[PDB]
Amino acid sequence: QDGEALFKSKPCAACHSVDTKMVGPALKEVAAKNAGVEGAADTLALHIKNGSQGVWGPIPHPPNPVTEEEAKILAEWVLSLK
Ligand code: HEC
């Protein structure tokens, strides 16, 4: 239940989406790309916690430092989606 709540207080969706896409790829396209990578949360971590670009487009990522606890839960709801 905290998965949706975490993606809420975290406006990651404000820029991300699920079935529309605007600035970044919906958690589905990103969750599908890191689906074959059991270390998805790791890849998504260095991309947010350490900016990221040259992947989904020329638009880089802001400095989004999160705690391994929240990054782990947010990485489980993002990779699990539904
Ligand atoms: C608009 C300013 C954004 C906000 C706010 C957040 N994200 Fe984002 N994200 C955005 C873009 C444009 C992209 C694609 C960049 C590219 O060119 O590749 C992304 C991508 C991600 C990714 C995947 C990056 C990759 O696989 O290389 C993740 C894991 C991701 N974003 C996470 C994330 C989180 C947790 C956010 C809230 C803290 C968040 N994003 C906000 C644009 C924007």
From Swiss-Prot:
Impact after mutating residue 46 to G: In strain: 221
Residues reported in the UniProt entry to bind heme c: 12, 15-16, 61
PTMs per UniProt: Binds 1 heme c group covalently per subunit.
Transmembrane segments: none
Cell compartment(s), UniProt: Periplasm
Gene Ontology terms for molecular function: electron transfer activity; heme binding; iron ion binding
Keyword set includes Amino-acid biosynthesis: no
Coiled coil: none
Keywords, sorted A to Z: Electron transport, Heme, Iron, Metal-binding, Periplasm, Signal, Transport
GO CC field: periplasmic space
Biological role stated in the UniProt entry: Electron donor for cytochrome cd1 in nitrite and nitrate respiration.
Protein name, UniProt field: Cytochrome c-551
Source organism: Stutzerimonas stutzeri
